[PDB]
Design a protein around this ligand. Structure first.
Ligand SMILES: Cn1cc(-c2cc(=O)[nH]c3ccc(Nc4ccnc(Cl)c4C#N)cc23)cn1
Ligand SMILES: Cn1cc(-c2cc(=O)[nH]c3ccc(Nc4ccnc(Cl)c4C#N)cc23)cn1
Ligand SMILES: [Cl-]
Ligand SMILES: [Cl-]
Ligand SMILES: [Cl-]
Ligand SMILES: [Cl-]
Lengths: 125, 5, 125, 5
């Protein structure tokens, strides 16, 4: 209908609870491997935040995998920062990690993150 | 909270 | 860190994508049965929005069930309205459904919905 | 959108 009321904080409260489930390893259904590092997550949150994971988990074979191995060129800290952003809306962007975060966001297909990385780099030129 | 969206 | 930047629309964009996955029946992992009606959903979204589903899906046996049957006194339209609220932040509250929505929200343990129902009822007294 | 939270 068009007569709905809306609870402003609902979406951010849902995301907070999804991150609490991730911290406690509750109903996590995939491990993402980035070289020597493993990250447990929920496939639905990954798909909802990344064009690459949306493609992977809508594929009729890959949707059933419990482990996904990323390209060896992907930096684990860059992936960790982006996984935290997926679950919190907060991006820990620093001079020492911006190149790795931007490269990881291009690979994961996260256009808003790629945008703010490009803007922060351009401001330092 | 609640608002008219 | 405390030096994060934040993307304002991220949480609402995640919730929109979770609702699109639900509409397309992508990676839904539970069917909620409410008398004669069935509703497919993602356990993590249900837990993130409801004290009852949080208790059910953190139980070591019930976490593995693919079907959950609700109490026969629960109204299917009331449940449908609340499931749509879980996935959108929008509550279709009307004179004809408020009693069923409030009863369903009390059973599901959704305190903000119970609150706005009580306020709308009190305004009509 | 991006802001300082
Ligand atoms: C179709 N497509 C969308 C993207 C994409 C690019 C990007 O920069 N960010 C994204 C962020 C999230 C997503 N996920 C979705 C997009 C549209 N509908 C659905 Cl159901 C999902 C999911 N789950 C997708 C993207 C790539 N291909
Ligand atoms: C511990 N507890 C919380 C509730 C609860 C009540 C209520 O009115 N609304 C809720 C809405 C959502 C939830 N889900 C959670 C609450 C706290 N931490 C986590 Cl990890 C979840 C999840 N997933 C829980 C509730 C009931 N018992
Ligand atoms: Cl596997
Ligand atoms: Cl993004
Ligand atoms: Cl079952
Ligand atoms: Cl609520």
């Amino acid at each position: 209908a068009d007569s709905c009321i809306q609870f402003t904080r609902h979406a951010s409260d849902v995301l907070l609870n999804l991150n609490r489930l991730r911290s406690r390893d509750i109903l996590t259904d995939v491990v993402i491997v980035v070289s020597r590092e493993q990250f447990r997550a929920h496939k639905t949150v990954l798909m909802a935040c990344s064009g690459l994971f949306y493609s992977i988990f809508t594929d009729q074979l890959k949707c059933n995998l419990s482990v996904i191995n990323l390209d060896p060129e992907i930096n684990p800290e860059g992936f960790c920062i982006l996984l935290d952003f997926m679950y919190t809306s907060r991006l820990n962007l620093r001079e020492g990690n911006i190149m790795a975060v931007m490269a990881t966001a291009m690979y994961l297909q996260m256009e808003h993150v790629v945008d703010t990385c490009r803007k922060f780099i351009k401001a330092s030129e | 909270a609640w608002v008219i969206p």
